[PDB]
Design a protein around this ligand. Structure first.
Ligand SMILES: [Cl-]
Ligand SMILES: [Cl-]
Ligand code: NA
Length: 121
């Protein structure tokens, strides 16, 4: 059940303004692993958008995708900070990439999304 921890190794800058599939190349240490452990967190305050953003996180091997999701629910105008996170395992596939896609772009205003690889085996 054990694995090699990478601490909070950022995977990259997450765009808040697109619903396109965002690609991140894995750090080289993880490129020989069989599985990767990732941590995705988000927060939204007085947002510029409203509605559910199911953020899709996945690796792929050919046509096969290995998908996880995280809810971000911006609500424009609110005077509070909402926040969510999840940490989950994905197969480390031959293209050495991991993907993130917003289903609704939450906007940059008063919001954030941070994406890390925290381990591998
Ligand atoms: Cl965040
Ligand atoms: Cl919340
Ligand atoms: Na929350």
């Amino acid at each position: 059940a054990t694995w090699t921890s990478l601490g909070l190794t950022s995977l990259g800058a997450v765009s808040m303004t697109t619903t396109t599939e965002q690609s991140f190349t894995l750090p080289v240490a993880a490129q020989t692993a069989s599985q990767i452990l990732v941590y995705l967190r988000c927060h939204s305050g007085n947002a510029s958008t409203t509605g559910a953003d199911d953020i899709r996180i996945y690796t792929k091997e050919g046509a096969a995708t290995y998908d996880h999701y995280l809810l971000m629910f911006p609500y424009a105008g609110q005077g509070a900070v909402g926040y969510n996170s999840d940490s989950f395992w994905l197969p480390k596939t031959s293209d050495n990439k991991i993907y993130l896609a917003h289903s609704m772009a939450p906007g940059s205003a008063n919001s954030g999304c941070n994406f890390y690889i925290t381990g591998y085996k």
